[PDB]
Design a binder for this molecule. Structure first.
Ligand SMILES: CC(C)C[C@@H](N)P(=O)(O)O
Ligand SMILES: [Zn+2]
Length: 864
């Protein structure tokens, strides 16, 4: 069964009220529902999704005639007007390792319903265009389960003689089933509040383990920032007098926006300076923000169907990105977002699983929680902002909510509102949702008479879903610099400005920027103005100029990225010829000017010193030997490390001095640490023996996790025995901290040392490792899967190991397995010996009896 967007039809039934009652016992939990049903297409059979053990079903209090087949329950004869359905189900939550539905974690009970988990709790119409008002009663042993939560307001509760107690939660806002949540357990509470702009108090409650409670203060503060910001930037206000957040250690995703009761992977909720990196702190802020932002972009307005997922996720990622940029370091954070997009989304769009931001079809929707839908999604939203300016963007938002509050809508609807609110036509803009693949811009510039003539071509390649790709609406932001690097004005569309947005809408256009009276070098796609590859024929000297002098952060960074890229290409040539490495003399010149320029933002400096990844370097190539790209990259870094070794120590020391013992998270302090960690990595490349020194004062350097992580990362590839001793000490010191143990496993899994495969196989049996825990599994196995020299070992060991673990995880958690199997996405682009080995492994996965739909769908795309 494949689901197609073209077949969407409205539901035959609506569900008006959903009354749930949960009776929690050992080992089983019994769910009794009462649904109020409203026929839309009278006489149609009533069709309910469900997979929990069914004990009884009734229509108006009476035993119903029905049939159960697969995961559907069908009742043929049903009233021609309002009726009730009552379903009784039974669940064994300790047996649930998929972590979808109602499941156990650390002795407590949690739910995860998006996208189709609710049907694992009860039989229901489990689709997001069906919206109902829920009231949830929960009964459980008081001592084992003192804390009992669901969405909305708590309106009643009591005690029973036998030790049980009960609560009743009423959520007055209609909602689709994926936004339901229940939590039951012995949990510590952290209390606070925010007062909305119209003077209402909102009680905030974070729930964690008793031991984890001291690590939740920064999450709380981030939430209060996020609430404030949604008021001031979007005019959005919270709509209940309670907001609850619950941390859980077994969780497949990052976090979940259930209405008034968000549930969060601990890793996006818990931090202190001793156990979390500054980056961990920044993740907490974006993710807490993100989930709070969903309250409007997702909850108040939800999705008509899952094909529309990006209507909530692209827009909400844009929101969280804007929140973080407004808090601090906007340009640096923009680049970070771009780099992530190019490093993970682009390879997606170039590979077997490429899909549109709004898929036309899917077998299993859990496979479409992807970088394309989320990050490419946010870029598309961002382009509306680019075309319309902030004020015009907020007008779209207003009309969006005016029209669609309380509805389940589509990406077309969102487009229409940005279009109608500003009286502009965005018909062509729809292709950003329906056409997959990364557009490629070919660009030429000519200065003749006093005009700079900029010719621009676009193609979008075929992807596996679609061959025909029509030209798109693509904004390209541009500047010019003279030989001395200063801004240059030009005349475009009437105005004389120093920058413009050129709007490419055709296969090829020329843009005339008139009034130029200097030799100029153009700066293109400023701010990464659209998610595309641009080729322009720049000299190295042109790049050196852009880098030293250009006013836009991205374009300066892209220029360094481009030099790094050219240097790696040069390295591949010589190593391939068996000759000495190139001298990269201009590059080294440029790095030196970056290292030494003290007017550069510290974090930005750090990004300028980052070399593109192996996946970026093999973009577009065929017959890839990943190790040869890896050896080329490694050679560059070794050259940079050795060549500038003493400047790496000095930068380090300047950064230490600037940090000034301010060990707590702050954007300012974090910037210095980011730079200090880049130096540590280069130093330990050039001089692995410096590890013994580092060890001698480890205590003294380990003033926070940012420092321990950065030192541990820098040595992680060192073949010294000391590397192993330090990891073992790290495991020992932080053995009770599960999020820190995830770091240990990530280090084990990512190491470039020659023995990583066996060290990984020992880690599987470490007393703190659980294959059944998604954080752990990703940490060790996911990391190994991305470890280029080891995953792509010529002997096939890496591919065989990963394929076994795909097979093994998929028996309890198909989601984690389907994410893992994507490590093989490069299959058809590898050189023949590795391709054969990859194809064998994918055949072996395919051959497993009982293989999930999740993994099957992915292996099909790679193999067939
Ligand atoms: C699948 C679900 C738990 C995650 C999303 N709704 P996000 O808010 O993490 O995007
Ligand atoms: Zn989300």
């Amino acid at each position: 069964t494949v689901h197609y967007l073209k077949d969407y039809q409205t539901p035959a039934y609506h569900i008006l009220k959903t009354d749930l009652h949960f009776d929690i016992n050992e080992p089983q939990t019994v769910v009794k529902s009462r649904l109020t049903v409203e026929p839309q297409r009278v006489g149609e059979p009533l069709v309910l999704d469900g997979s929990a053990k069914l004990l009884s079903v009734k229509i108006n209090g009476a035993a119903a005639d029905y049939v159960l087949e697969g995961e559907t329950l069908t009742i043929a004869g049903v009233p021609s007007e309002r009726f009730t359905v009552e379903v009784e189900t039974e669940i064994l939550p300790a047996e649930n390792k998929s972590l979808m539905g109602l499941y156990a974690s650390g002795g407590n009970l949690f739910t995860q319903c998006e996208p189709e988990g609710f049907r694992k709790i009860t039989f229901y119409i489990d689709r997001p265009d069906v919206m109902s008002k829920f009231t949830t009663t929960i009964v459980a042993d008081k001592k084992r389960y003192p804390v009992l939560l669901s969405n909305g307001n708590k309106i009643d509760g009591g005690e029973f003689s036998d030790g049980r107690h009960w609560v009743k939660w009423e959520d007055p806002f209609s909602k689709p089933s994926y936004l339901f949540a229940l939590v039951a357990g012995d949990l510590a509470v952290t209390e606070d509040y925010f007062t909305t702009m119209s003077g209402r108090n909102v009680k905030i409650e974070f729930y964690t383990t008793e031991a984890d409670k001291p690590k939740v203060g920064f999450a709380v503060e981030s939430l209060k920032n996020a609430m404030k910001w949604d008021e001031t930037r979007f005019g959005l206000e919270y709509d209940l007098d309670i907001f609850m957040v619950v941390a859980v250690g077994d969780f497949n995703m990052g976090a979940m926006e259930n209405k008034g009761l968000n549930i969060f992977n601990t890793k996006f909720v818990l931090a202190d300076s001793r156990t979390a990196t500054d980056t961990d702190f920044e993740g907490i802020e974006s993710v807490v923000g993100h989930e709070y932002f969903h309250n409007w972009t997702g909850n108040r307005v939800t999705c008509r169907d899952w094909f529309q997922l990006s209507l909530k996720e692209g827009l909400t990622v844009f929101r969280d990105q804007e929140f973080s940029g407004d808090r601090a370091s906007r340009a640096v954070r923009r680049i970070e977002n771009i780099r992530l997009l190019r490093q993970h989304q682009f390879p997606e769009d170039a590979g077997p699983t490429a899909h549109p931001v709004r898929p036309a079809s899917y077998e299993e929707m859990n496979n479409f929680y992807t970088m394309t839908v989320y990050e490419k999604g946010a870029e598309v939203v961002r382009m509306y902002h680019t075309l319309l300016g902030e004020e015009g963007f907020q007008k779209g938002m207003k009309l969006y909510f005016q029209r669609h509050d309380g509805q389940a809508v589509t990406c077309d609807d969102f487009r229409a509102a940005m279009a109608d609110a500003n009286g502009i036509n965005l018909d062509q803009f729809a292709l950003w949702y329906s056409q997959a693949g990364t557009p490629v811009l070919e660009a030429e510039g000519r200065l003749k008479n006093n005009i700079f003539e900029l010719t621009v071509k676009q193609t979008v390649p075929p992807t596996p879903d679609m061959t025909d790709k029509q030209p798109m609406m693509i904004p390209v932001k541009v500047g010019l610099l003279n030989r001395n690097g200063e801004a240059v004005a030009f005349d475009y569309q009437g105005k004389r400005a120093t920058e413009a947005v050129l709007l490419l809408t055709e296969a090829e256009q020329t843009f005339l920027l008139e009034g130029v009276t200097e030799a100029v070098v153009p700066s293109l796609l400023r701010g990464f103005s659209a998610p595309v590859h641009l080729n322009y024929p720049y000299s190295d000297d042109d790049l050196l100029l852009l880098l030293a002098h250009d006013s836009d952060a991205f374009t300066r960074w892209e220029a360094a990225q481009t030099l790094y890229r050219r240097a790696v290409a040069a390295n591949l040539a010589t190593l391939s010829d068996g000759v000495e490495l190139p001298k990269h003399e201009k590059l080294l010149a440029a790095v030196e000017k970056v290292i030494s320029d003290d007017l550069l933002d510290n974090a930005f400096k750090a990004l300028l010193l980052g070399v593109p990844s192996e996946a970026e370097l093999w973009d577009g190539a065929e017959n890839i030997d990943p190790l040869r790209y890896h050896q080329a990259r490694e050679a560059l870094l070794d050259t940079l490390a050795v060549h500038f070794l003493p400047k790496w120590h000095e930068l380090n020391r300047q950064a230490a001095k600037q940090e000034n013992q301010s060990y707590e998270y702050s954007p300012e302090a974090a910037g210095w640490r980011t730079l200090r960690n880049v130096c540590r990595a280069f130093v330990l490349r050039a001089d692995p023996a410096h590890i013994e020194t580092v060890a001698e004062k480890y205590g003294e350097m380990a003033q926070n996790m940012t420092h321990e992580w950065g030192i541990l990362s820098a040595v992680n590839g060192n073949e010294s025995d000391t590397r192993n001793r330090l990891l073992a000490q790290f495991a020992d010191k932080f053995s009770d901290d599960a999020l820190v143990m995830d770091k240990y496993f990530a280090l084990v899994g990512s190491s470039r040392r020659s023995d990583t495969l066996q060290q990984v196989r020992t880690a599987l049996q470490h007393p703190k490792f659980s294959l059944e825990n998604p954080n752990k599994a990703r940490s060790l196995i996911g990391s190994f899967s991305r470890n280029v020299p080891h995953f792509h070992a010529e002997d096939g060991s890496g591919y065989r190991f990963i394929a076994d673990k795909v097979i093994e995880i998929d028996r309890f958690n198909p989601q984690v397995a389907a994410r893992l199997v994507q490590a093989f996405n490069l299959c058809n682009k590898l050189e023949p010996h590795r391709k054969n080995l990859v194809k064998q492994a994918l055949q072996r996965i395919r051959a497993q009896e009982g293989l999930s739909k999740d993994v099957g769908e992915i292996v099909g795309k790679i193999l067939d």
